[PDB]
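request received
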Amino acid sequence: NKGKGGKNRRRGKNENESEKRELVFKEDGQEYAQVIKMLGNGRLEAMCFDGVKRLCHIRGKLRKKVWINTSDIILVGLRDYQDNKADVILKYNADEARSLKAYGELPEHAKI
Amino acid sequence: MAVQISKKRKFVADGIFKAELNEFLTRELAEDGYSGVEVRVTPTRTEIIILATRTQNVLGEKGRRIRELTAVVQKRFGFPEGSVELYAEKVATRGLCAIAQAESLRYKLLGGLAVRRACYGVLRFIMESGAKGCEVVVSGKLRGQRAKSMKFVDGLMIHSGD
Amino acid sequence: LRITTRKTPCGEGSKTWDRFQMRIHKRLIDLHSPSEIVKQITSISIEPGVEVEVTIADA
Amino acid sequence: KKSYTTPKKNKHKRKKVKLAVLKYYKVDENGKISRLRRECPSDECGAGVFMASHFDRHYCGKCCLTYCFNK
Amino acid sequence: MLMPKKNRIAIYELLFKEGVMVAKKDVHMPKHPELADKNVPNLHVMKAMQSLKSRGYVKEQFAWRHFYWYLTNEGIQYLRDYLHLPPEIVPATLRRSR
Amino acid sequence: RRKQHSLLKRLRKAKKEAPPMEKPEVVKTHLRDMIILPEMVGSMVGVYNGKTFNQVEIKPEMIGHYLGEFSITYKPVKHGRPGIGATHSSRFIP
Amino acid sequence: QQLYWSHPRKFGQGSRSCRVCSNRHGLIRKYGLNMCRQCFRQYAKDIGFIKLD
RNA sequence: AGGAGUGGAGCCUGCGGCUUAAUUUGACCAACACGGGAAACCUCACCCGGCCCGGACACGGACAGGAUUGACAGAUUGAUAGCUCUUUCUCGAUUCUGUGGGUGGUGGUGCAUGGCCGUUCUUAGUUGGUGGAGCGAUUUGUCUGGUUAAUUCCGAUAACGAACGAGACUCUGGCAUGCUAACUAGUUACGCGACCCCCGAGCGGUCGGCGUCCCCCAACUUCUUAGAGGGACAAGUGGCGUUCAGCCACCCGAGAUUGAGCAAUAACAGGUCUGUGAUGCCCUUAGAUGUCGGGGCUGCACGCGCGCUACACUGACUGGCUCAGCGUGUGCCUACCCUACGCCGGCAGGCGCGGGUAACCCGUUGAACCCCAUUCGUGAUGGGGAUCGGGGAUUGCAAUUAUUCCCCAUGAACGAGGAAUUCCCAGUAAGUGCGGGUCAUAAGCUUGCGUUGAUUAAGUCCCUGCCCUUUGUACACACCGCCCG
RNA sequence: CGAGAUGGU
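response:
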């Protein structure tokens, strides 16, 4: 279907971010966050909605696939040690982020 | 047939009949070494001649399979009783028939023999039988989860023109 | 008889076509003879894949 | 091609009632028989087979699309 | 019920007499052709022959929307019992070919 | 009209059994291709829409129209703002 | 068992299907063939059609 | 160098975005009138509801005062689904029930595969054996030069002798008054026969003119069909060529380039699991991801692609005259074909009665542009025909979100199109209409056929690309590469 | 000898 970059490289399998994108909520050890700044080297600064800011890192599965950006909404996994640091699990589209807030899942802080 | 059908429909329907008969015989007589069917007509009677390498398997213990095949050919295609006869005939020069060599390579692979040992086994027998050349190809998941192919060739081989 | 079809099984590629045909040939011969002897001569050399049909009066 | 969202008026099938075999004959005296429920006026069903009695109808269970009398 | 016993006997007697069966893969046609006239549908023929195959009493083949079935020695033994025929009968195929 | 007379029976039952000088109860149906006959005037019908029944009070001006002409299968469109890919200039590079 | 278990099928794509493989799309009605277009290219030589031009 | 355009207008149709219960989905030069994809139902996969088993076979249980099957009426229901509830007849070992196990699926993965197709790539390219050269990856053969559409030939030569592609080959077009021979094809002529005209030397005639008017037990094969052979070779003459291989002009001739099919080695994470009883693994399997009723695929601020009709006088309208070629036709489950002639109606259409399984009947296939005469008069006009009101037929089980067709009325934008950009060298481009496919109903698409018939070239490497050789490199994921502060 | 940078699948 429609490309949205432009290049020779048709050598991959297509992204298909479609159909049964079943909505995901927290388990234990997770938080929702908004991206505040993006740094070099595959890392970023993020704020979760109960107010603890963290330095955050892209998991190896999301490299060069799920492009994160400033003010974007993400799902983050906490560490049982080293509480200043965390890793990204998912990105929510602006269509999914409004459904989280419609289920009352997010405080009235997140931008959409 | 209360009034006869037109020649365009008649010549197409006679070709559709030979195609379905060849498919039925192909999958009934595969291990029994089938390679072709021929059909001929005479007043009140149709004779079907069938070619195979091991003709005793086409007959069975006292001709049982010729009687069973005569019954189902009559039952399916709507011939009247006793107007159909089946004759088995032995294939001459079986090394120069491509269908008998494709089936014997299939059963040799299905028994678990290694691919190159099997393929050079038929390549030798075709060239010893007196062909001017041949080409054997196998393709799919040969050794690993990513697909491959092999070509085996000997002698002369044309590709273009009539 | 003619049939013209797309070559592709699935609808992708540049748009090529196949052109199949079949040709049919027909003849007539008329005789001045008894009904008993057309049955003799219309029974030899007819071994190949040729239709033969005969009608008892048309002339 | 999805997970399934369920209905809530659930039955698999009904249950067919269980009853003892025969109450359409009576012995009244030694060697005296009565037939308690009637045969329908019919070609094949004319003997040994009986019409039901309902509160306002007589009905043949064998000829089931028809053979109903309104009393 | 799968079918009336009147139907089930009429399939087995035609199979035992002829030695073979043929039917097309279509559950909707109201009558099987040939000596299965006098009312049995070909759905009953397909379902009957499937039950006879999983017992080992017939062989099966298929091409271009048609089934083909052949009777075998264990099935001859079972049908001669089920139909109560004399032990000496073999009505379908016997004479040696030349 | 083989077994399409059943609606006309249910409509004339509802016209008969209504309280004096008050409207009948609804009869609800799938029959969208029924023509409005002069028997059907001053009657309540629920006409199926692909998921729900919409009620109609049959005015005499409706005569000769279909029942399906008064119960519509979709919502009128009103637009939200265009998305990515809607124009040639809209392209995204990471 | 139900009495209403079928709908009319006396014309259109509900009536007809391929004689080899039961498919309903892209079939050939010409000269009484009734094959699917992919099944025709497979059997054309055995039926007796050829290409010259 | 030029021709017809496309991009601008209205409408048709495919795609994105938005909207929605659903607007099912694949594909981004080599996707977008493509899936032979013209969806009323079916097709059908999507959305809202409801019946059904079409759960083989094995083991255990239950069971001939009986395992189980079917149903009238009232309530219920979109429904005449005994689906379910109340009631009480009916069938007869075929089922039911628990466990194990199967079976089906237009479900998922084309980045697990087979088969098929497209593309690199329409160009001239590719490879062993024995011998020679290098420690080796590799190389020569497969070439300095000339010649050709061509790795086509000549010749040269540490190589010799071969294989595939090219070419040959198959179908097709143009020629035969020579051959074979026709009541399912014609001509000529007369025994003649018949209607009409005197226009004709001359009468109303032997004799003339006109004929798809009619017999032949007349003669024949020019015109039609289609079998066998024939014919063209750079063969002849003049120039140019390491005088070879070839190239240019001209005579004679139907003809000195007719047009297609088939096509190598090695590749691509190209497309297809939605063509298949081709198929691995995964998922689901009775409150089913295996049948009926209704809805959607057509929804509309907006961006893009292939097309149809036009902006008029080299025209539009109303009469009159006169010419084609390729094809299809009573459906074998599946239930329908092509039509002459007569009558009724303005029209679409209706009734009656015949022929055709086809060189036999529709049919001498009375095609359109074009040709001859008339009316309008430079006016958004008698150019253009979008949009919209009212009425009448035909298909079908059903036409509203208008199936298609006929009639009166209404009368938009548009006055030759910005930056850009496509196809084409002779019976070709463009104009013009007719068959086949799909089809119960129906082309603004596509695949073939005839008819009218030009302007400009006979060249080049400039722009975009392809082939071969020499050359440089920090590239090999191969310039859409790699890399510095 | 006009101007001609850059590179998610």
